Protein backbone atom coordinates (compact mmCIF):
# COMPACT_ATOMS: atom_id res chain seq x y z
CA UNK A 1 0.00 0.00 0.00
CA UNK A 2 1.26 4.02 -1.06
CA UNK A 3 -0.50 6.66 -1.23
CA UNK A 4 0.77 7.29 -4.35
CA UNK A 5 3.42 5.59 -6.94
CA UNK A 6 5.01 7.17 -9.53
CA UNK A 7 6.55 5.94 -12.92
CA UNK A 8 9.42 7.44 -13.83
CA UNK A 9 12.90 9.00 -12.32
CA UNK A 10 13.88 11.62 -14.34
CA UNK A 11 13.35 15.00 -13.76
CA UNK A 12 9.34 15.01 -13.68
CA UNK A 13 9.35 11.65 -11.17
CA UNK A 14 12.19 12.99 -8.54
CA UNK A 15 10.78 16.20 -8.43
CA UNK A 16 7.01 14.69 -7.88
CA UNK A 17 8.75 12.37 -5.44
CA UNK A 18 10.38 14.87 -3.56
CA UNK A 19 7.25 16.94 -3.22
CA UNK A 20 4.57 14.22 -2.24
CA UNK A 21 6.87 12.42 0.41
CA UNK A 22 8.63 15.19 2.06
CA UNK A 23 5.87 17.94 1.95
CA UNK A 24 2.62 16.23 2.26
CA UNK A 25 4.31 13.21 4.11
CA UNK A 26 3.15 10.79 1.73
CA UNK A 27 3.90 6.94 1.26
CA UNK A 28 5.30 7.06 -1.69
CA UNK A 29 7.32 4.95 -4.24
CA UNK A 30 8.85 5.64 -7.78
CA UNK A 31 9.81 3.01 -10.27
CA UNK A 32 12.05 2.86 -13.05
CA UNK A 33 13.86 0.51 -15.60
CA UNK A 34 16.92 2.11 -15.36
CA UNK A 35 19.54 1.41 -13.17
CA UNK A 36 19.95 5.46 -12.06
CA UNK A 37 17.87 8.66 -12.11
CA UNK A 38 17.99 11.03 -14.13
CA UNK A 39 15.82 9.34 -17.50
CA UNK A 40 16.24 11.06 -20.59
CA UNK A 41 19.70 12.61 -19.52
CA UNK A 42 20.33 8.40 -18.13
CA UNK A 43 19.47 6.62 -21.50
CA UNK A 44 20.95 9.57 -23.95
CA UNK A 45 24.45 9.34 -23.85
CA UNK A 46 25.27 10.28 -27.38
CA UNK A 47 28.42 12.56 -28.54
CA UNK A 48 27.31 15.98 -28.07
CA UNK A 49 24.15 15.83 -26.64
CA UNK A 50 23.57 19.33 -24.81
CA UNK A 51 20.75 21.32 -23.50
CA UNK A 52 18.51 23.55 -25.73
CA UNK A 53 18.30 25.96 -22.28
CA UNK A 54 20.91 27.83 -20.71
CA UNK A 55 22.69 25.66 -18.05
CA UNK A 56 21.22 28.34 -15.13
CA UNK A 57 17.76 27.61 -15.74
CA UNK A 58 17.86 23.77 -17.27
CA UNK A 59 17.61 23.07 -13.72
CA UNK A 60 15.22 22.78 -10.14
CA UNK A 61 14.12 26.24 -8.34
CA UNK A 62 12.72 24.57 -5.87
CA UNK A 63 16.06 24.46 -3.43
CA UNK A 64 17.66 27.72 -3.18
CA UNK A 65 20.87 25.87 -1.58
CA UNK A 66 21.26 23.85 -4.88
CA UNK A 67 20.96 27.25 -7.12
CA UNK A 68 24.00 28.26 -4.97
CA UNK A 69 25.74 25.36 -5.53
CA UNK A 70 24.85 25.04 -9.32
CA UNK A 71 27.91 23.67 -11.01
CA UNK A 72 27.54 26.12 -13.73
CA UNK A 73 30.67 25.45 -16.36
CA UNK A 74 29.42 26.56 -19.79
CA UNK A 75 26.19 28.24 -21.12
CA UNK A 76 24.89 25.17 -22.00
CA UNK A 77 25.37 21.97 -20.35
CA UNK A 78 26.32 18.23 -21.12
CA UNK A 79 24.60 15.65 -20.62
CA UNK A 80 27.12 13.98 -18.72
CA UNK A 81 26.57 17.01 -16.63
CA UNK A 82 23.01 16.97 -16.46
CA UNK A 83 23.13 13.40 -14.74
CA UNK A 84 25.61 14.27 -12.37
CA UNK A 85 23.57 17.00 -11.78
CA UNK A 86 20.22 14.70 -11.16
CA UNK A 87 22.40 12.51 -9.06
CA UNK A 88 23.46 15.55 -6.70
CA UNK A 89 19.80 16.35 -5.76
CA UNK A 90 18.67 12.50 -5.27
CA UNK A 91 21.92 12.60 -2.90
CA UNK A 92 20.87 15.50 -1.34
CA UNK A 93 17.08 14.85 -0.62
CA UNK A 94 17.62 11.14 0.20
CA UNK A 95 15.89 10.21 -2.64
CA UNK A 96 16.88 6.90 -3.73
CA UNK A 97 15.61 5.07 -0.72
CA UNK A 98 12.59 4.98 -2.44
CA UNK A 99 12.72 4.27 -6.23
CA UNK A 100 12.86 0.80 -7.12
CA UNK A 101 15.36 0.95 -10.28
CA UNK A 102 15.31 -1.78 -13.15
CA UNK A 103 11.88 -1.98 -12.41
CA UNK A 104 9.83 -1.96 -15.73
CA UNK A 105 5.65 -1.12 -14.74
CA UNK A 106 3.80 -3.53 -16.98
CA UNK A 107 -0.04 -2.52 -16.26
CA UNK A 108 -1.94 -0.49 -13.42
CA UNK A 109 -5.37 -1.29 -13.64
CA UNK A 110 -7.76 1.07 -11.31
CA UNK A 111 -9.97 -0.64 -8.70
CA UNK A 112 -13.53 1.45 -8.68
CA UNK A 113 -14.54 -0.61 -5.47
CA UNK A 114 -11.88 0.16 -3.60
CA UNK A 115 -10.82 3.40 -5.53
CA UNK A 116 -7.22 2.56 -6.02
CA UNK A 117 -4.26 1.40 -8.68
CA UNK A 118 -3.08 -1.96 -8.78
CA UNK A 119 0.11 -0.84 -10.33
CA UNK A 120 1.80 -4.86 -11.19
CA UNK A 121 6.09 -4.42 -12.71
CA UNK A 122 7.36 -6.83 -15.04
CA UNK A 123 8.70 -9.08 -12.75
CA UNK A 124 5.10 -9.89 -11.65
CA UNK A 125 5.52 -7.48 -8.32
CA UNK A 126 1.75 -6.13 -7.07
CA UNK A 127 1.39 -2.73 -5.88
CA UNK A 128 -1.30 -0.79 -4.68
CA UNK A 129 -2.04 3.10 -4.36
CA UNK A 130 -4.56 5.56 -4.17
CA UNK A 131 -2.65 8.21 -6.93
CA UNK A 132 -0.43 6.92 -9.95
CA UNK A 133 1.77 9.50 -10.97
CA UNK A 134 3.30 9.21 -14.51
CA UNK A 135 6.68 10.78 -14.93
CA UNK A 136 6.95 9.23 -18.36
CA UNK A 137 9.07 12.00 -20.56
CA UNK A 138 8.16 13.33 -23.88
CA UNK A 139 9.41 10.71 -26.37
CA UNK A 140 8.54 7.21 -26.84
CA UNK A 141 10.25 4.21 -28.14
CA UNK A 142 13.46 4.90 -30.68
CA UNK A 143 12.38 5.01 -34.14
CA UNK A 144 14.72 2.66 -36.32
CA UNK A 145 14.40 3.35 -40.09
CA UNK A 146 12.60 0.86 -42.30
CA UNK A 147 15.42 0.36 -44.95
CA UNK A 148 15.49 -2.98 -46.84
CA UNK A 149 18.61 -5.15 -45.97
CA UNK A 150 19.21 -3.21 -42.71
CA UNK A 151 19.34 -6.43 -40.62
CA UNK A 152 22.22 -7.81 -43.05
CA UNK A 153 24.80 -4.82 -42.11
CA UNK A 154 27.75 -6.17 -40.45
CA UNK A 155 29.61 -2.82 -38.94
CA UNK A 156 28.33 -0.94 -35.79
CA UNK A 157 24.86 0.23 -35.95
CA UNK A 158 22.95 1.91 -32.99
CA UNK A 159 20.43 4.39 -32.86
CA UNK A 160 21.17 7.09 -30.69
CA UNK A 161 19.04 6.52 -27.84
CA UNK A 162 21.33 3.19 -27.56
CA UNK A 163 24.85 4.78 -28.18
CA UNK A 164 27.01 1.99 -25.83
CA UNK A 165 29.82 3.19 -24.46
CA UNK A 166 33.68 2.64 -25.85
CA UNK A 167 32.85 3.97 -29.29
CA UNK A 168 35.97 4.60 -31.69
CA UNK A 169 36.09 6.80 -34.75
CA UNK A 170 39.28 7.01 -35.96
CA UNK A 171 40.06 5.68 -39.74
CA UNK A 172 36.00 4.29 -39.72
CA UNK A 173 34.02 5.32 -42.57
CA UNK A 174 30.95 7.12 -40.68
CA UNK A 175 27.18 7.72 -41.91
CA UNK A 176 24.22 9.60 -40.33
CA UNK A 177 20.70 8.75 -40.92
CA UNK A 178 18.71 11.99 -39.94
CA UNK A 179 19.35 15.70 -39.19
CA UNK A 180 17.19 17.22 -36.84
CA UNK A 181 18.54 18.40 -33.33
CA UNK A 182 20.07 15.10 -32.43
CA UNK A 183 21.52 14.08 -35.89
CA UNK A 184 23.00 17.76 -35.84
CA UNK A 185 24.66 17.82 -32.36
CA UNK A 186 25.99 14.19 -33.69
CA UNK A 187 27.53 15.17 -36.85
CA UNK A 188 28.95 18.45 -35.42
CA UNK A 189 30.54 16.63 -32.62
CA UNK A 190 32.44 13.54 -34.48
CA UNK A 191 33.05 14.99 -38.45
CA UNK A 192 36.36 15.45 -37.23
CA UNK A 193 37.00 12.13 -35.57
CA UNK A 194 36.05 9.81 -38.65
CA UNK A 195 37.97 8.94 -41.65
CA UNK A 196 34.90 10.08 -43.77
CA UNK A 197 31.64 10.97 -42.95
CA UNK A 198 28.20 10.74 -44.80
CA UNK A 199 25.26 12.65 -44.04
CA UNK A 200 22.15 11.15 -45.51
CA UNK A 201 19.55 14.10 -45.01
CA UNK A 202 15.95 13.38 -46.15
CA UNK A 203 14.68 16.98 -44.89
CA UNK A 204 17.00 19.58 -44.20
CA UNK A 205 16.16 22.08 -41.55
CA UNK A 206 17.48 25.39 -40.10
CA UNK A 207 19.79 25.73 -37.31
CA UNK A 208 21.24 28.67 -35.41
CA UNK A 209 24.18 29.09 -33.59
CA UNK A 210 24.01 27.70 -29.84
CA UNK A 211 27.17 30.32 -28.74
CA UNK A 212 27.98 27.57 -26.24
CA UNK A 213 31.00 29.15 -24.37
CA UNK A 214 32.78 29.10 -20.76
CA UNK A 215 31.63 30.84 -18.12
CA UNK A 216 33.57 33.12 -16.34
CA UNK A 217 33.82 32.86 -12.23
CA UNK A 218 32.36 36.72 -12.71
CA UNK A 219 29.26 35.46 -14.87
CA UNK A 220 28.53 33.16 -12.28
CA UNK A 221 28.38 35.07 -9.48
CA UNK A 222 26.19 37.93 -11.42
CA UNK A 223 23.57 34.86 -12.25
CA UNK A 224 23.88 33.67 -8.85
CA UNK A 225 23.06 36.80 -7.03
CA UNK A 226 20.21 37.80 -8.75
CA UNK A 227 18.95 34.73 -8.84
CA UNK A 228 15.43 35.13 -7.41
CA UNK A 229 14.71 37.52 -10.20
CA UNK A 230 15.77 35.17 -13.21
CA UNK A 231 13.53 32.92 -11.44
CA UNK A 232 10.10 35.55 -11.04
CA UNK A 233 11.23 36.06 -14.73
CA UNK A 234 11.01 32.68 -15.97
CA UNK A 235 7.07 32.59 -14.01
CA UNK A 236 6.14 36.03 -16.48
CA UNK A 237 7.65 34.47 -19.58
CA UNK A 238 5.41 32.58 -22.16
CA UNK A 239 9.05 30.36 -23.13
CA UNK A 240 11.14 30.24 -19.40
CA UNK A 241 14.13 30.24 -21.20
CA UNK A 242 15.55 33.73 -19.50
CA UNK A 243 14.92 35.62 -23.11
CA UNK A 244 13.67 38.76 -23.67
CA UNK A 245 10.76 38.34 -25.50
CA UNK A 246 9.50 40.64 -27.98
CA UNK A 247 6.83 42.26 -29.18
CA UNK A 248 8.38 44.26 -32.04
CA UNK A 249 6.65 43.36 -35.32
CA UNK A 250 9.32 41.97 -38.05
CA UNK A 251 8.05 44.22 -41.05
CA UNK A 252 7.56 47.66 -38.87
CA UNK A 253 11.66 48.16 -39.01
CA UNK A 254 13.91 48.96 -42.13
CA UNK A 255 15.56 46.28 -43.76
CA UNK A 256 18.86 47.20 -42.22
CA UNK A 257 17.97 47.34 -38.82
CA UNK A 258 15.84 44.08 -38.85
CA UNK A 259 19.34 42.55 -40.20
CA UNK A 260 21.01 43.97 -37.16
CA UNK A 261 18.27 42.77 -34.95
CA UNK A 262 18.57 38.98 -36.56
CA UNK A 263 22.28 39.61 -36.36
CA UNK A 264 22.57 40.24 -32.90
CA UNK A 265 20.73 37.21 -31.80
CA UNK A 266 22.98 34.70 -34.25
CA UNK A 267 26.34 35.90 -32.44
CA UNK A 268 24.60 35.39 -28.99
CA UNK A 269 23.14 31.85 -30.10
CA UNK A 270 20.05 29.73 -29.23
CA UNK A 271 17.22 28.72 -31.18
CA UNK A 272 13.98 29.95 -29.18
CA UNK A 273 16.09 33.22 -29.30
CA UNK A 274 16.34 33.70 -32.53
CA UNK A 275 13.01 32.98 -33.12
CA UNK A 276 11.01 35.24 -30.28
CA UNK A 277 13.54 37.04 -28.67
CA UNK A 278 13.98 39.06 -32.17
CA UNK A 279 10.67 39.83 -33.17
CA UNK A 280 7.60 38.90 -32.09
CA UNK A 281 5.22 37.57 -35.30
CA UNK A 282 7.70 35.09 -37.20
CA UNK A 283 5.65 32.15 -35.75
CA UNK A 284 2.23 34.02 -36.43
CA UNK A 285 2.89 35.58 -39.89
CA UNK A 286 3.78 34.43 -43.36
CA UNK A 287 5.72 37.09 -44.02
CA UNK A 288 7.64 37.76 -40.94
CA UNK A 289 8.79 33.83 -41.14
CA UNK A 290 10.18 34.43 -44.63
CA UNK A 291 12.59 37.25 -43.48
CA UNK A 292 13.72 34.70 -40.77
CA UNK A 293 14.02 31.79 -43.13
CA UNK A 294 15.94 34.37 -45.86
CA UNK A 295 18.36 35.34 -43.02
CA UNK A 296 19.50 31.79 -42.05
CA UNK A 297 19.85 30.74 -46.23
CA UNK A 298 22.05 33.55 -46.17
CA UNK A 299 23.90 32.17 -43.31
CA UNK A 300 24.19 28.69 -44.77
CA UNK A 301 25.64 30.79 -48.73
CA UNK A 302 28.07 32.65 -46.49
CA UNK A 303 29.40 29.25 -44.79
CA UNK A 304 28.85 26.77 -46.99
CA UNK A 305 31.82 27.46 -49.34
CA UNK A 306 30.66 25.39 -52.32
CA UNK A 307 27.72 26.56 -53.33
CA UNK A 308 25.92 23.07 -54.48
CA UNK A 309 26.22 21.38 -51.43
CA UNK A 310 24.80 24.92 -49.83
CA UNK A 311 21.70 24.44 -51.82
CA UNK A 312 21.11 20.76 -50.72
CA UNK A 313 21.44 22.19 -47.17
CA UNK A 314 19.24 25.17 -47.68
CA UNK A 315 15.48 23.89 -46.39
CA UNK A 316 12.28 24.34 -48.68
CA UNK A 317 9.71 25.39 -45.83
CA UNK A 318 8.39 27.32 -42.69
CA UNK A 319 10.94 28.26 -39.91
CA UNK A 320 8.60 26.45 -37.44
CA UNK A 321 8.00 24.27 -34.65
CA UNK A 322 10.78 23.69 -31.92
CA UNK A 323 14.32 25.78 -33.39
CA UNK A 324 17.06 24.11 -33.83
CA UNK A 325 20.63 24.81 -32.60
CA UNK A 326 24.12 23.64 -33.55
CA UNK A 327 27.87 24.04 -32.64
CA UNK A 328 29.62 24.67 -36.10
CA UNK A 329 27.00 22.21 -38.10
CA UNK A 330 27.31 24.14 -41.25
CA UNK A 331 31.04 24.49 -41.21
CA UNK A 332 31.54 20.40 -41.30
CA UNK A 333 30.41 20.76 -44.79
CA UNK A 334 33.28 21.95 -46.17
CA UNK A 335 35.51 19.32 -44.40
CA UNK A 336 36.82 17.26 -47.18
CA UNK A 337 36.01 13.93 -45.72
CA UNK A 338 32.18 14.94 -45.36
CA UNK A 339 30.22 14.36 -48.13
CA UNK A 340 25.67 15.09 -48.15
CA UNK A 341 23.32 12.68 -49.59
CA UNK A 342 20.12 14.34 -50.60
CA UNK A 343 18.22 11.01 -49.61
CA UNK A 344 14.96 13.13 -51.00
CA UNK A 345 16.10 13.42 -54.42
CA UNK A 346 18.19 10.01 -53.74
CA UNK A 347 16.14 7.70 -51.83
CA UNK A 348 18.07 4.90 -49.64
CA UNK A 349 16.49 1.48 -51.19
CA UNK A 350 18.91 -0.94 -49.42
CA UNK A 351 21.27 -2.02 -46.84
CA UNK A 352 23.75 -4.54 -47.00
CA UNK A 353 26.52 -6.26 -45.16
CA UNK A 354 29.13 -3.48 -45.84
CA UNK A 355 26.58 -0.36 -47.25
CA UNK A 356 24.01 1.81 -47.39
CA UNK A 357 22.73 1.81 -51.25
CA UNK A 358 21.39 4.69 -52.95
CA UNK A 359 18.43 5.26 -55.59
CA UNK A 360 21.51 5.52 -57.86
CA UNK A 361 23.05 2.53 -57.58
CA UNK A 362 25.91 3.93 -55.04
CA UNK A 363 27.11 1.65 -52.55
CA UNK A 364 28.07 3.93 -49.54
CA UNK A 365 30.50 1.44 -48.07
CA UNK A 366 30.35 2.09 -44.23
CA UNK A 367 32.30 0.53 -40.67
CA UNK A 368 29.53 2.03 -38.66
CA UNK A 369 25.79 4.04 -39.14
CA UNK A 370 24.16 5.83 -37.10
CA UNK A 371 20.79 5.94 -36.52
CA UNK A 372 19.79 9.90 -35.59
CA UNK A 373 15.85 8.47 -36.76
CA UNK A 374 13.76 9.85 -33.41
CA UNK A 375 11.36 8.19 -31.59
CA UNK A 376 7.56 7.89 -31.38
CA UNK A 377 5.36 10.51 -30.44
CA UNK A 378 4.71 11.38 -26.78
CA UNK A 379 1.46 9.23 -26.05
CA UNK A 380 3.32 5.84 -26.74
CA UNK A 381 4.73 5.83 -23.45
CA UNK A 382 1.87 6.08 -22.04
CA UNK A 383 0.22 2.93 -24.47
CA UNK A 384 3.12 0.60 -24.21
CA UNK A 385 2.18 0.19 -20.79
CA UNK A 386 -1.30 -1.41 -19.87
CA UNK A 387 -3.69 0.70 -18.27
CA UNK A 388 -7.00 0.42 -17.78
CA UNK A 389 -9.12 2.79 -15.90
CA UNK A 390 -13.21 2.68 -15.30
CA UNK A 391 -15.18 -0.04 -16.90
CA UNK A 392 -11.78 -1.24 -17.92
CA UNK A 393 -10.79 0.75 -20.44
CA UNK A 394 -7.75 0.91 -22.00
CA UNK A 395 -5.06 3.75 -23.03
CA UNK A 396 -4.33 2.51 -25.72
CA UNK A 397 -8.24 2.54 -26.85
CA UNK A 398 -8.98 6.00 -25.12
CA UNK A 399 -6.31 7.65 -27.22
CA UNK A 400 -6.28 5.74 -30.50
CA UNK A 401 -6.78 9.29 -32.45
CA UNK A 402 -3.82 10.95 -30.20
CA UNK A 403 -3.98 12.42 -26.81
CA UNK A 404 -6.11 14.30 -25.10
CA UNK A 405 -6.54 15.59 -21.17
CA UNK A 406 -7.73 18.01 -19.18
CA UNK A 407 -4.61 21.04 -18.35
CA UNK A 408 -2.39 18.34 -19.74
CA UNK A 409 -2.61 15.99 -16.17
CA UNK A 410 -5.66 14.43 -16.33
CA UNK A 411 -7.24 11.72 -18.73
CA UNK A 412 -11.09 11.40 -18.29
CA UNK A 413 -11.68 7.43 -17.11
CA UNK A 414 -8.91 7.18 -15.37
CA UNK A 415 -9.08 8.72 -11.95
CA UNK A 416 -6.34 9.45 -9.87
CA UNK A 417 -4.11 9.45 -12.56
CA UNK A 418 -2.02 12.03 -12.57
CA UNK A 419 0.37 13.32 -15.55
CA UNK A 420 3.71 14.97 -14.91
CA UNK A 421 5.43 16.96 -18.68
CA UNK A 422 1.77 14.91 -20.07
CA UNK A 423 0.73 15.53 -23.71
CA UNK A 424 -1.45 18.81 -24.49
CA UNK A 425 1.08 20.63 -22.24
CA UNK A 426 2.78 24.09 -22.24
CA UNK A 427 5.60 24.62 -25.18
CA UNK A 428 8.11 25.96 -22.50
CA UNK A 429 11.25 25.14 -21.10
CA UNK A 430 10.82 21.36 -19.50
CA UNK A 431 11.53 22.01 -15.59
CA UNK A 432 9.44 24.97 -15.35
CA UNK A 433 6.99 23.27 -16.81
CA UNK A 434 7.53 20.14 -14.18
CA UNK A 435 7.38 22.30 -11.05
CA UNK A 436 4.35 23.59 -12.03
CA UNK A 437 2.30 20.10 -12.82
CA UNK A 438 4.46 18.67 -9.38
CA UNK A 439 3.44 21.20 -7.51
CA UNK A 440 -0.60 21.41 -8.79
CA UNK A 441 -0.80 18.03 -8.60
CA UNK A 442 0.20 17.92 -4.93
CA UNK A 443 -1.88 20.25 -3.60
CA UNK A 444 -4.84 19.03 -5.26
CA UNK A 445 -4.00 15.30 -3.35
CA UNK A 446 -3.67 17.38 -0.21
CA UNK A 447 -6.91 18.87 -1.16
CA UNK A 448 -8.35 15.00 -1.46
CA UNK A 449 -6.90 14.44 1.73
CA UNK A 450 -8.14 17.21 4.02
CA UNK A 451 -11.82 16.74 2.70
CA UNK A 452 -11.65 13.08 2.61
CA UNK A 453 -12.23 12.47 -1.28
CA UNK A 454 -11.06 9.07 -2.67
CA UNK A 455 -11.59 9.50 -6.47
CA UNK A 456 -10.50 12.61 -8.81
CA UNK A 457 -11.50 12.34 -12.33
CA UNK A 458 -11.40 15.12 -14.78
CA UNK A 459 -14.94 15.34 -16.90
CA UNK A 460 -15.35 14.51 -20.71
CA UNK A 461 -16.10 18.09 -21.16
CA UNK A 462 -13.20 19.68 -19.43
CA UNK A 463 -11.34 17.20 -21.72
CA UNK A 464 -12.86 18.59 -24.65
CA UNK A 465 -12.84 22.17 -23.48
CA UNK A 466 -9.11 21.56 -22.99
CA UNK A 467 -8.94 20.39 -26.58
CA UNK A 468 -10.55 23.57 -28.04
CA UNK A 469 -8.39 26.06 -25.80
CA UNK A 470 -5.46 24.69 -27.65
CA UNK A 471 -6.62 24.30 -30.98
CA UNK A 472 -7.29 27.70 -31.15
CA UNK A 473 -4.40 28.79 -29.64
CA UNK A 474 -2.45 27.03 -32.21
CA UNK A 475 -4.53 27.77 -35.01
CA UNK A 476 -3.81 31.56 -35.10
CA UNK A 477 -0.09 30.34 -35.65
CA UNK A 478 2.06 28.60 -38.63
CA UNK A 479 3.03 25.71 -36.18
CA UNK A 480 -0.56 24.91 -36.91
CA UNK A 481 0.53 24.44 -40.48
CA UNK A 482 4.02 23.28 -41.47
CA UNK A 483 5.85 19.67 -40.60
CA UNK A 484 -6.76 16.35 -31.06
CA UNK A 485 -3.80 18.70 -30.12
CA UNK A 486 -0.13 17.74 -28.64
CA UNK A 487 0.45 21.22 -27.26
CA UNK A 488 -0.68 24.00 -25.36
CA UNK A 489 0.72 26.93 -26.84
CA UNK A 490 -0.68 29.75 -25.03
CA UNK A 491 3.06 29.80 -22.68
CA UNK A 492 4.07 29.29 -19.30
CA UNK A 493 2.81 32.27 -17.74
CA UNK A 494 -1.05 31.70 -19.49
CA UNK A 495 -0.47 27.88 -18.81
CA UNK A 496 -0.31 29.10 -15.01
CA UNK A 497 -3.40 30.98 -14.95
CA UNK A 498 -5.11 28.47 -16.61
CA UNK A 499 -4.71 25.38 -13.87
CA UNK A 500 -4.83 28.49 -11.11
CA UNK A 501 -8.09 28.93 -12.17
CA UNK A 502 -9.07 25.81 -12.07
CA UNK A 503 -7.51 25.02 -8.51
CA UNK A 504 -8.96 28.73 -6.89
CA UNK A 505 -12.65 27.55 -7.85
CA UNK A 506 -13.18 24.15 -6.49
CA UNK A 507 -11.49 22.13 -9.32
CA UNK A 508 -13.85 22.84 -12.08
CA UNK A 509 -14.32 20.26 -14.28
CA UNK A 510 -12.77 17.45 -11.60
CA UNK A 511 -15.73 14.86 -10.92
CA UNK A 512 -14.43 14.91 -7.19
CA UNK A 513 -16.02 11.28 -4.58
CA UNK A 514 -16.60 11.24 -1.17
CA UNK A 515 -16.18 8.43 1.16
C1 LIG B 1 19.94 16.08 -25.41
C2 LIG B 1 18.62 16.62 -24.90
C3 LIG B 1 18.51 17.96 -24.56
C4 LIG B 1 17.31 18.49 -24.08
N1 LIG B 1 17.26 19.83 -23.73
C5 LIG B 1 16.12 20.31 -23.29
C6 LIG B 1 16.06 21.72 -22.94
O1 LIG B 1 16.99 22.52 -22.97
N2 LIG B 1 14.81 22.14 -22.49
C7 LIG B 1 13.69 21.35 -22.37
O2 LIG B 1 12.65 21.88 -21.97
N3 LIG B 1 13.75 20.02 -22.71
C8 LIG B 1 14.91 19.54 -23.14
N4 LIG B 1 14.99 18.20 -23.47
C9 LIG B 1 13.78 17.37 -23.30
C10 LIG B 1 13.85 16.46 -22.06
O3 LIG B 1 13.10 15.26 -22.29
C11 LIG B 1 13.22 17.16 -20.85
O4 LIG B 1 13.95 18.36 -20.57
C12 LIG B 1 13.20 16.36 -19.55
O5 LIG B 1 14.50 15.85 -19.26
C13 LIG B 1 12.18 15.24 -19.47
O6 LIG B 1 12.22 14.67 -18.15
P1 LIG B 1 11.06 13.70 -17.64
O7 LIG B 1 11.38 13.26 -16.23
O8 LIG B 1 9.78 14.39 -17.82
O9 LIG B 1 11.14 12.41 -18.61
P2 LIG B 1 12.36 11.43 -18.89
O10 LIG B 1 13.63 12.07 -18.52
O11 LIG B 1 12.13 10.91 -20.29
O12 LIG B 1 12.10 10.29 -17.86
C14 LIG B 1 11.06 9.32 -18.09
C15 LIG B 1 11.44 8.06 -17.36
O13 LIG B 1 10.27 7.20 -17.30
C16 LIG B 1 10.73 5.88 -17.40
N5 LIG B 1 9.63 4.98 -17.78
C17 LIG B 1 8.79 5.06 -18.86
N6 LIG B 1 7.93 4.06 -18.95
C18 LIG B 1 8.24 3.26 -17.86
C19 LIG B 1 7.70 2.05 -17.37
N7 LIG B 1 6.69 1.40 -17.96
N8 LIG B 1 8.25 1.52 -16.26
C20 LIG B 1 9.27 2.16 -15.67
N9 LIG B 1 9.85 3.31 -16.03
C21 LIG B 1 9.29 3.81 -17.13
C22 LIG B 1 11.86 5.93 -18.43
O14 LIG B 1 12.74 4.82 -18.28
C23 LIG B 1 12.54 7.26 -18.08
O15 LIG B 1 13.69 7.05 -17.27
C24 LIG B 1 16.19 17.64 -23.95
C25 LIG B 1 16.30 16.29 -24.31
C26 LIG B 1 17.50 15.78 -24.78
C27 LIG B 1 17.60 14.31 -25.14
N1 LIG C 1 18.21 16.43 -29.16
C1 LIG C 1 18.01 17.63 -28.47
O1 LIG C 1 18.99 18.34 -28.17
C2 LIG C 1 16.65 17.96 -28.13
C3 LIG C 1 15.70 17.17 -28.69
N2 LIG C 1 14.37 17.40 -28.43
C4 LIG C 1 13.37 16.69 -29.21
O2 LIG C 1 13.76 15.34 -29.39
C5 LIG C 1 12.95 14.85 -30.45
C6 LIG C 1 13.80 13.98 -31.35
O3 LIG C 1 14.79 14.78 -31.91
P1 LIG C 1 15.60 13.76 -33.04
O4 LIG C 1 16.17 12.75 -32.13
O5 LIG C 1 16.49 14.74 -33.77
O6 LIG C 1 14.48 12.99 -33.91
P2 LIG C 1 13.65 13.86 -35.07
O7 LIG C 1 12.46 12.98 -35.20
O8 LIG C 1 13.47 15.31 -34.68
O9 LIG C 1 14.55 13.83 -36.48
C7 LIG C 1 14.47 12.53 -37.02
C8 LIG C 1 15.42 12.63 -38.24
O10 LIG C 1 15.62 11.37 -38.90
C9 LIG C 1 15.09 11.51 -40.23
N3 LIG C 1 14.45 10.21 -40.58
C10 LIG C 1 13.48 9.50 -39.86
N4 LIG C 1 13.12 8.34 -40.45
C11 LIG C 1 13.91 8.30 -41.60
C12 LIG C 1 14.00 7.37 -42.63
N5 LIG C 1 13.22 6.23 -42.62
N6 LIG C 1 14.87 7.58 -43.67
C13 LIG C 1 15.61 8.70 -43.64
N7 LIG C 1 15.63 9.68 -42.71
C14 LIG C 1 14.75 9.45 -41.69
C15 LIG C 1 14.05 12.71 -40.19
O11 LIG C 1 13.95 13.16 -41.44
P3 LIG C 1 12.39 13.91 -41.88
O12 LIG C 1 12.60 15.25 -41.25
O13 LIG C 1 12.43 13.86 -43.40
O14 LIG C 1 11.46 12.96 -41.18
C16 LIG C 1 14.83 13.65 -39.24
O15 LIG C 1 15.85 14.19 -40.00
C17 LIG C 1 12.50 16.13 -31.27
O16 LIG C 1 11.17 16.35 -31.00
C18 LIG C 1 13.35 17.22 -30.65
O17 LIG C 1 12.73 18.47 -30.65
C19 LIG C 1 13.98 18.30 -27.40
C20 LIG C 1 14.88 19.12 -26.82
C21 LIG C 1 16.32 19.12 -27.23
Not at 198 to 222: C, H, L, W
Not at 300 to 308: C, M
Not at 332 to 360: H, Q
Request: charged share 25%.
Amino acid sequence: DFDAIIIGAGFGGLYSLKKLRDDFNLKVRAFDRATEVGGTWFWNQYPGALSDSETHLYCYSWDKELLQEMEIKRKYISQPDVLAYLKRVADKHDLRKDIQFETGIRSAYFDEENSFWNVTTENDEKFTARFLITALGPLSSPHLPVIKGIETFKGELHHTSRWPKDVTFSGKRVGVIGTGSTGVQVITAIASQVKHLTVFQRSAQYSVPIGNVVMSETDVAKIKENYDQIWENVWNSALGYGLNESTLPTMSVSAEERDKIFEKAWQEGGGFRFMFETFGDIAVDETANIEAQNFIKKKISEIVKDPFVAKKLTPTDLYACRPLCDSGYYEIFNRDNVSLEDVKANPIVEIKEDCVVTADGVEHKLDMLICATGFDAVDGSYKRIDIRGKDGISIKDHWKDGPNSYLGMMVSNFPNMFMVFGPNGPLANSPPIIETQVRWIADLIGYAEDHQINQIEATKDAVDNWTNTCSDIANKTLFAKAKTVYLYMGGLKEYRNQISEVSNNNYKGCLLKQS
